[PDB]
Design an enzyme around this catalytic site. Structure first.
Site, mmCIF file in Angstrom:
data_model
loop_
_atom_site.group_PDB
_atom_site.id
_atom_site.type_symbol
_atom_site.label_atom_id
_atom_site.label_comp_id
_atom_site.label_asym_id
_atom_site.label_seq_id
_atom_site.Cartn_x
_atom_site.Cartn_y
_atom_site.Cartn_z
ATOM 1 N N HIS A 13 0.825 -1.147 -0.012
ATOM 2 C CA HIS A 13 -0.017 0.020 -0.176
ATOM 3 C C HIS A 13 0.885 1.395 -0.012
ATOM 4 O O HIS A 13 1.470 1.751 1.149
ATOM 5 C CB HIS A 13 -1.067 0.212 1.098
ATOM 6 C CG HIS A 13 -1.865 1.365 0.998
ATOM 7 N ND1 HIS A 13 -3.468 1.265 1.212
ATOM 8 C CD2 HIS A 13 -1.577 2.759 1.012
ATOM 9 C CE1 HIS A 13 -3.773 2.496 1.096
ATOM 10 N NE2 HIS A 13 -2.849 3.515 1.000
ATOM 11 N N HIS A 55 2.062 4.845 -2.815
ATOM 12 C CA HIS A 55 1.514 5.830 -4.025
ATOM 13 C C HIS A 55 2.872 6.539 -4.501
ATOM 14 O O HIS A 55 3.803 6.643 -3.685
ATOM 15 C CB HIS A 55 0.790 6.812 -3.474
ATOM 16 C CG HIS A 55 -0.187 6.588 -2.992
ATOM 17 N ND1 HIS A 55 -1.527 6.376 -3.401
ATOM 18 C CD2 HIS A 55 -0.656 6.323 -1.658
ATOM 19 C CE1 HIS A 55 -2.604 6.091 -2.643
ATOM 20 N NE2 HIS A 55 -2.043 6.027 -1.374
ATOM 21 N N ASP A 73 -4.180 1.737 12.460
ATOM 22 C CA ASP A 73 -4.793 3.309 13.036
ATOM 23 C C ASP A 73 -5.494 2.945 14.192
ATOM 24 O O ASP A 73 -6.275 4.190 14.994
ATOM 25 C CB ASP A 73 -5.594 4.131 11.955
ATOM 26 C CG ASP A 73 -4.926 4.868 11.043
ATOM 27 O OD1 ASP A 73 -3.659 4.623 11.001
ATOM 28 O OD2 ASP A 73 -5.308 5.626 9.894
ATOM 29 N N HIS A 131 0.264 2.245 8.050
ATOM 30 C CA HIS A 131 0.526 3.426 8.386
ATOM 31 C C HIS A 131 1.518 3.712 9.576
ATOM 32 O O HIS A 131 1.776 4.565 10.244
ATOM 33 C CB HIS A 131 -0.705 4.179 9.050
ATOM 34 C CG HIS A 131 -1.591 4.578 7.787
ATOM 35 N ND1 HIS A 131 -2.641 5.273 8.340
ATOM 36 C CD2 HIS A 131 -1.380 5.020 6.665
ATOM 37 C CE1 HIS A 131 -3.360 5.842 7.038
ATOM 38 N NE2 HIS A 131 -2.633 5.618 6.176
ATOM 39 N N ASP A 176 2.579 3.424 3.207
ATOM 40 C CA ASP A 176 1.358 4.575 2.679
ATOM 41 C C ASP A 176 2.363 5.620 2.425
ATOM 42 O O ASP A 176 1.968 6.640 2.720
ATOM 43 C CB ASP A 176 0.317 4.744 3.672
ATOM 44 C CG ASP A 176 -1.011 5.215 2.865
ATOM 45 O OD1 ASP A 176 -0.809 5.398 1.650
ATOM 46 O OD2 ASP A 176 -1.844 5.883 3.521
#
Ligand SMILES: CCOP(=O)(Cc1ccc(C)cc1)OCC
Ligand SMILES: CCOP(=O)(Cc1ccc(C)cc1)OCC
Lengths: 330, 329
Positions: free
Chosen positions: A21, A23, A199, A220, A267
């Site tokens: 995950h 980008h 989270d 995260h 992330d």
């Protein structure tokens, strides 16, 4: 057998250490092409990304999954170019995020299904580059449109074998509503990854999903505004839980027997226009290791907390291979 | 002196009969490239547009202003290709409408000004094609972000001389708040066209803005769901006023001495993804003449109603030229 990448298909064995995950850039549909100067320049952005990917590669990362959807401003040509320059495999996505334009918002579940299959079977835009995963999102109770997206994702996934990955408001337990929708469509939990799961501190919510067969994405890790509490926007985005706290959740699930259900990521990104201006500056200060944070910091930390090295390998190599491999229902 | 078109600059004289508010396709940023099949195919959309444009050209139309902004899914390469193929001049736009993405919604007025100037001075994307008009929109009371758009549009206009054209909720008298903000930026009303104005019967509102020096855009002439009322979506979109009712607003304004401030258009398109599926079919049925509706139907009507031909020529040729010519304060 095969997984689609921006450079074509690879065998499962070639994926290696994979970050599930991430980008290259966080933006909006058409934005990078219309206002490249926002990121300095396209060239500046790509250079930055190549550097970062080469650092990750040096740390052992072989493949990254860029979960940027059409509405996240995914630019598959940018992905193919950086992939080639850094020599890092990149899996592209289809799906829809929280910022769909009217032309998408007014579509039916059948039409959306069509669009998803298109990106997966035919390819993105006119490139012939096929999506290898479907990304969806909710943030609290699903809106009626989000419910359509979820159903469409499930149907495209049932037709193709390609996995589904989600953004959740973990603290609000979205994962449970997503599961319910997916299951109502006949989708197997093993084709789904419930993300942003680190989270929350509620292990009961996590273990319950794990027990159902869902994959839990602890993506995260490096997100923490700790020491930045003075920045409203930063703290709002990153949170105030420490990276150590998030990492121990990985150990916690392992300890409960769910190692095969864990997926870990950063992330991260190299450009980010869908937020406040200059936000990247802050992130880069927060996590100078960027995508190499996982292998450089988290692995060793876990090792030191007692997690056996092979377990760590199973999590970063084995789980992702299984997840990504297109798998059709009985 | 020259006006920017998708095939380059033209002189004012070359514009001729100009349609001031139109579109080749009504879509969303990146949509055309990502899902061209939604329109059949990119080719089909292009062929449809060329035929439509050749038919308007046959009726005398030499130039069209495509008011599609980035968020309307404007594809300048598509525009350049149909322009060349139909031999009709196409003026491209910058600005923002009502469906901006987050990357735009979070920008400051200063950043937005920079983006508009970019499209106008440097060109759209990497094409080098420069925008010749700025499109903005409100839908009743402006939102905070919309207020920022209008201010940035004003600033870009004051620096370049390019005009501003707007979408209004005429019924709600949006034009009034628009004017206020523009004027607050120091922009001359003469550089502004308040669009969709035939959407209202309030002549008091119209002559008020006209008296202030603003241009009045009567560009929804052929929009009517009369007889199509069994369709909620079409009705919502087109209204239930007849085209003749809208056309008479033109005559009214002329009668009041505002001939120099009127700009007429059809607000037509050849593709439309930002609405319910199949909406095109319905529209094509309502106005088979497409963009030629104005010259084929409206002009003669007005003529028959008593308007002098010359007046008609002033509205369709002179007014647009003057509006489009880049003009600094
Ligand atoms: C199983 C042996 O690990 P691997 O195949 C991929 C790999 C590299 C680094 C880390 C921290 C984990 C996994 O080593 C590549 C040289
Ligand atoms: C003055 C003569 O108008 P014009 O320059 C442009 C023009 C053509 C048709 C109509 C209905 C209005 C205006 O005619 C050239 C063919």
């Amino acid at each position: 057998d095969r997984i689609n990448t921006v450079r074509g298909p690879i065998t499962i064995s070639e994926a290696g250490f994979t970050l599930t995950h991430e980008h290259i850039c966080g933006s909006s549909a058409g934005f990078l092409r219309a206002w490249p100067e926002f990121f300095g320049s396209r060239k500046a952005l790509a250079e930055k990304a190549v550097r970062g990917l080469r650092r990750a590669r040096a740390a052992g990362v072989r493949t990254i999954v860029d979960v940027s959807t059409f509405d996240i401003g995914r630019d598959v040509s940018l992905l193919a170019e950086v992939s080639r320059a850094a020599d890092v495999h990149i899996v592209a996505a289809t799906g829809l995020w929280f910022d769909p334009p009217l032309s998408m918002r007014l579509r039916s579940v059948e039409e959306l299904t069509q669009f998803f299959l298109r990106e997966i079977q035919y390819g993105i835009e006119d490139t012939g580059i096929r999506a290898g995963i479907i990304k969806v999102a909710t943030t609290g109770k699903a809106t009626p449109f989000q419910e359509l997206v979820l159903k469409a994702a499930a149907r495209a996934s049932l037709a193709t074998g390609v996995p589904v990955t989600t953004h959740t408001a973990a603290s609000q337990r979205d994962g449970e509503q997503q599961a319910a929708i997916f299951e109502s469509e006949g989708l197997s939990p093993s084709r789904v990854c419930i993300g942003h799961s680190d989270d929350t501190d509620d292990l009961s919510y996590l273990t319950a999903l794990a027990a159902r067969g869902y994959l839990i994405g602890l993506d995260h890790i490096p997100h923490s505004a700790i020491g930045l509490e003075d920045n409203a926007s930063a703290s709002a985005l990153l949170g105030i839980r420490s990276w150590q706290t998030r990492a121990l959740l990985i150990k916690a699930l392992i300890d409960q027997g769910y190692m095969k259900q864990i997926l870990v990521s950063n992330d991260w990104l190299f450009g980010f226009s869908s937020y406040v201006t200059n936000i990247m500056d802050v992130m880069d200060r927060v996590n100078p290791d960027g995508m190499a944070f996982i292998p450089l910091r988290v692995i060793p930390f876990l090792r030191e907390k007692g997690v056996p090295q092979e377990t760590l390998a199973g999590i970063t190599v084995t789980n992702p291979a299984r997840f990504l491999s297109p798998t059709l229902r009985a």
